[PDB]
């Protein structure tokens, strides 16, 4: 009748965009980088072990100053570490012990938290009283919070388990914009360096690029076969990598609107949990479920050194703003700070 021809038109359009992507791919990125010198073996040492948590760590986020990191754990405590000296600057007690994400504001004044309570609480560190209290409990999500990031001190874009990402206004408390179009639970987002764009990975094995001001999905890069456990941006903002649960990482391109390279190897069969990029973008660090954290060259797809000493699943990962250090937080309540040296 009417829905049948509409679905036929949709299938024809999908075929059209697929063949356009195939035609615009004259070659692949693997052959182009067959002459560039390899990054070689990379060794990273456990410079610090931010012990103090009493339960599994589920997220972390580096501050703008590349010194303070906030971590969230099932103990219900939002701890802000001084990674230079391993000092616990703040120990924020969460209202709900179940937290799946946290964030550090670019200004450093506010930190975020959220989880199974579907509330993306925001705490104000810099207060006259001297302690830390929740400022605005953002509510309105139907599902659990997955990963929430702040565009500015008033605008925060979030991701829930209700197939919809949202952009919030801290001052008012209502969703300025609501992002819809995903048919599965969304697990993580990744803000662009220039803040104009942001992508999100969902449970339908599809990563969609959205616009903060447009309010609608722009591109729906789709090459994965399983849920994207986390997404991340290239330093220049022209590409991103989507992690996934089928033990492979894919580096998509914004302009090409297609997969550029696939990161996988036979002996790894554990899905990627977190993904982050180095400052130069050459090294793609991913936190796997086999207690390791592999470091792949983003232009070669060869494993270059692993940060194997963590004893449990790496649940979170983060690279500093200046790229000086890489921090991973596992389920054994240990945050380890790493960097490269000879």
């Amino acid at each position, epitope marked *: 009748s009417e829905l049948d021809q509409l679905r036929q038109e949709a299938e024809q359009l999908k075929n059209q965009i697929r063949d356009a992507r195939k035609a615009c791919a004259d070659a692949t990125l693997s052959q182009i980088t067959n002459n560039i010198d390899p990054v070689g073996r990379i060794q990273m040492r456990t410079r610090r072990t931010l012990r103090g948590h009493l339960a599994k760590i589920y997220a972390m986020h580096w501050g703008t100053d590349s010194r303070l990191l906030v971590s969230a754990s099932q103990d219900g405590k939002l701890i802000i570490w*001084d990674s*230079y000296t391993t*000092n616990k*600057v703040h120990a924020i007690p969460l209202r709900s012990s179940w937290v799946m994400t946290c964030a550090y504001a670019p200004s450093g004044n506010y930190v975020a938290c959220g989880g199974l309570d579907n509330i993306c609480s925001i705490y104000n560190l810099k207060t*006259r*009283e*001297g*302690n830390v209290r929740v400022s605005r409990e953002l509510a309105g999500h139907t599902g659990y919070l997955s990963c929430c990031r702040f565009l500015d001190d008033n605008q925060i874009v979030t991701s829930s388990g209700d197939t919809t990402c949202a952009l919030w206004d801290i001052e008012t408390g209502q969703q300025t914009t609501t992002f819809t179009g995903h048919t599965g639970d969304v697990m993580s987002l990744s803000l662009a360096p220039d803040t104009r764009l942001f992508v999100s990975g969902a449970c339908d094995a599809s990563a969609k690029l959205w616009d903060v001001r447009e309010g609608m999905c722009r591109q729906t890069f789709t090459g994965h076969e399983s849920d994207i456990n986390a997404i991340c941006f290239f330093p220049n903002g022209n590409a991103f990598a989507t992690g996934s649960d089928d033990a492979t990482c894919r580096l998509f391109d914004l302009r090409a609107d297609q997969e550029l390279m696939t990161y996988s190897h036979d002996n790894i069969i554990c899905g990627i949990t977190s993904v982050s990029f180095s400052k130069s973008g050459r090294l793609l660090l991913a936190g796997y479920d086999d207690f390791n954290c592999n470091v792949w060259d983003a232009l070669k797809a060869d494993r270059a050194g692993v940060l194997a000493g963590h004893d449990n699943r790496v649940s979170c990962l983060g690279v500093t703003d200046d790229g000086m250090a890489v921090a991973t937080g596992s389920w054994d309540s240990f945050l380890k700070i790493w960097n490269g040296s000879s």
Partner: single-chain antibody, 232 residues
Framework: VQLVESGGGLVQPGGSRKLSCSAS????????MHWVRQAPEKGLEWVAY????????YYADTVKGRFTISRDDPKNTLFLQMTSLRSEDTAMYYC??????????????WGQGTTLTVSAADIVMTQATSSVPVTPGESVSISCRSS???????????LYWFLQRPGQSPQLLIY???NLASGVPDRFSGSGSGTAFTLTISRLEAEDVGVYYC?????????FGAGTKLEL
């Protein structure tokens, strides 16, 4: 936030007293407390400091073995015990709050203070000028000098600049020579090179008047500056 102190009066030398500092409007238990005295027509002088949770205790060498500072968390009141008084101990004693962590602003708030009238190595801090005639609308530079370089290996040089309004408790202006304290106008600016310490005021207004005190915070005992006074 507010700090109220009581226990002032005329006391014969060699007696005993009790100075009580009441804390209200903030989390007392998480704030370290200092006690600062100010001899009449003289500069401020450190007395004692007690850490958060009574963990660690410091006293000045002048009053060591005689004066003791004690916090009480459940009643939200700090207490300075007082005994073996002498004619040099008559001063305006201030209760001072300070919280210590990365990026914190210690010495941010000062209590009103009580008047005490008694009847009848360490870093030496020097300021070249004691009275600077000035008119509003210009720029003023205050010179502070230290016996030893305050810059540390961590990269932090511990400066603390204070403004004491006439008949008012001193107010924190700049900490670590570069971070502007909350509630302070943007016109104030500071700089330093490890030996030459300066404070700059971009433009002058009636409120800019006051005695300026520069601090070192590398190590205890705490020491105050000579005291640069601004007058119109």
């Amino acid at each position: 936030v507010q700090l109220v102190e009581s226990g002032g009066g005329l006391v014969q030398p060699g007696g005993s007293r009790k100075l009580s500092c009441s804390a209200s409007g903030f989390a007392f238990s998480s704030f370290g407390m200092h006690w600062v005295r100010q001899a009449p027509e003289k500069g401020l002088e450190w007395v004692a400091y007690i850490s958060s949770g009574s963990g660690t205790i410091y006293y000045a060498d002048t009053v060591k073995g005689r004066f003791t500072i004690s916090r009480d968390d459940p009643k939200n009141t700090l207490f300075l015990q007082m005994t073996s008084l002498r004619s040099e101990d008559t001063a305006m004693y201030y209760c001072v709050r300070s919280i210590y962590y990365y990026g914190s602003s210690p010495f941010d708030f000062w209590g009103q203070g009580t008047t005490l009238t008694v009847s009848a190595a360490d870093i030496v801090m020097t300021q070249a000028t004691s009275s600077v005639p000035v008119t509003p609308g210009e720029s003023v530079s205050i010179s502070c000098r230290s016996s030893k370089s305050l810059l540390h290996s961590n990269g932090n040089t511990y400066l603390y600049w204070f403004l004491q309004r006439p008949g008012q408790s001193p107010q924190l202006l700049i900490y670590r020579m570069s971070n502007l304290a909350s509630g302070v106008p943007d016109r104030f600016s500071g700089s330093g090179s490890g030996t030459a310490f300066t404070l700059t005021i971009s433009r002058l207004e009636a409120e800019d008047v006051g005695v300026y005190y520069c601090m070192q915070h590398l190590e205890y005992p705490l020491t105050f500056g000579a005291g640069t006074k601004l007058e119109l």
